[PDB]
Amino acid sequence: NEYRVRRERNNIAVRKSRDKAKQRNVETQQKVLELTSDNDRLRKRVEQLSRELDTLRG
Amino acid sequence: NSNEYRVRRERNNIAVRKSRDKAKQRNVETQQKVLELTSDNDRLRKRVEQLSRELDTLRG
DNA sequence: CATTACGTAATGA
DNA sequence: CATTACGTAATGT
Numbered sequence: 354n355e356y357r358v359r360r361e362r363n364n365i366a367v368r369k370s371r372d373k374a375k376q377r378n379v380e381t382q383q384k385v386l387e388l389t390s391d392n393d394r395l396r397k398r399v400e401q402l403s404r405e406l407d408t409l410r411g
Numbered sequence: 412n413s414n415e416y417r418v419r420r421e422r423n424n425i426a427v428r429k430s431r432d433k434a435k436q437r438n439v440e441t442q443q444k445v446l447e448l449t450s451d452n453d454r455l456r457k458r459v460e461q462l463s464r465e466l467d468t469l470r471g
Numbered sequence: 472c473a474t475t476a477c478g479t480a481a482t483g484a
Numbered sequence: 485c486a487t488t489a490c491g492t493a494a495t496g497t
Binding site: 378381382384385388389391392395396398399402403405406409 | 438441442444445448449451452455456458459462463465466469470
Binding site: 360364 | 476477478479480
């Protein structure tokens, strides 16, 4: 009957949506980790370049 | 007290709504953090390049 | 107490 | 079809 096949299609889609949202969350936390170490390396670079500018003698 | 099953269910349904609200807010705040770090890394990269061009200009 | 998989029905327009 | 909120039950996330 149509009811059971519509329900099974949705039951499959709800699982798929949930697995996909779990995937995006892992990917988003990865992204926060990569952007944060990039941020820290860029800050080290700025500090080091600023210090050279500030102490250049010629 | 009487009907402990319904007491526990009523309290758990509260915990569940609370947990789901919090998870949504954690999700928002994480996306905002990605935005923030992305725009800050952009700013930091322009700074590295503008400092570098200044050193290049001064040294040769 | 907080967290999460499950099936369902509504939303989406 | 994809997404979301719900209440339940199991479980220590």
